[PDB]
Amino acid sequence: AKFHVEGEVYCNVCHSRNLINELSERMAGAQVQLDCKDDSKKVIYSIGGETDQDGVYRLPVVGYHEDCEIKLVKSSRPDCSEIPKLAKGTIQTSKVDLSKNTTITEKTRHVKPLSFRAKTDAPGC
């Protein structure tokens, strides 16, 4: 089986907040990584890629997998490189479904967007 995992990366220009909104800017050149544990409780399948002009990455995956998620690794904007931890204390990752065990036929799986965060608050934040 082949898949592509597709998602977006932005710069959140509101350092005071942790979200993607109308002030958010699509980021080219960001680096992301797919990691799947495949129920072995350690990462055993991993794939990296970069976002394009629209801030979209598209990772080609071979095989079905479980316990998969996408994390930000590197920013291409030194002014926008925080990875905001959630109030829970954990880093946010985008989950993806690459399970054989469903009736989903699409070969592209889309994921929720991620953002790096600026150090300042833009006007209107």
Which residues contact Zn ion (rule: CB under 5 A)? 39, 66-67
Task: Mention every residue, 6+ apart, whose C-beta is less than 8 A from residue 1.
Answer: 62, 63, 64, 100
Residue closest to Zn ion, measured at CB:
67
Residue 22 assigned to a binding site: no
Residue 54 assigned to a binding site: no
Rounded to the nearest whole angstrom, what is the least distance from the CB of residue 37 to Zn ion in the complex? 7
What phi, psi does 120 have (nearest 5°)? -120, 175
User: What's the residue count for the chain?
Assistant: 125
Rounded to the nearest whole angstrom, what is the least distance from the CB of residue 3 to Zn ion in the complex? 17
Three-state DSSP at 33 gives strand
CA-CA distance, 125 to 119, in Å (whole number)?
Answer: 13
CB atoms < 10 A from the CB of 71, how many? 14
- Give whichever of 17 and 71 is closer to Zn ion, judged by the CB atom: 71
Residue 82 assigned to a binding site: yes
CB atoms < 10 A from the CB of 27, how many? 21
Rounded to the nearest whole angstrom, what is the least distance from the CB of residue 44 to Zn ion in the complex? 12
- Give whichever of 44 and 122 is closer to Zn ion, judged by the CB atom: 44
- Give whichever of 101 and 105 is closer to Zn ion, judged by the CB atom: 101
Rounded to the nearest whole angstrom, what is the least distance from the CB of residue 67 to Zn ion in the complex? 4
- Give whichever of 50 and 67 is closer to Zn ion, judged by the CB atom: 67
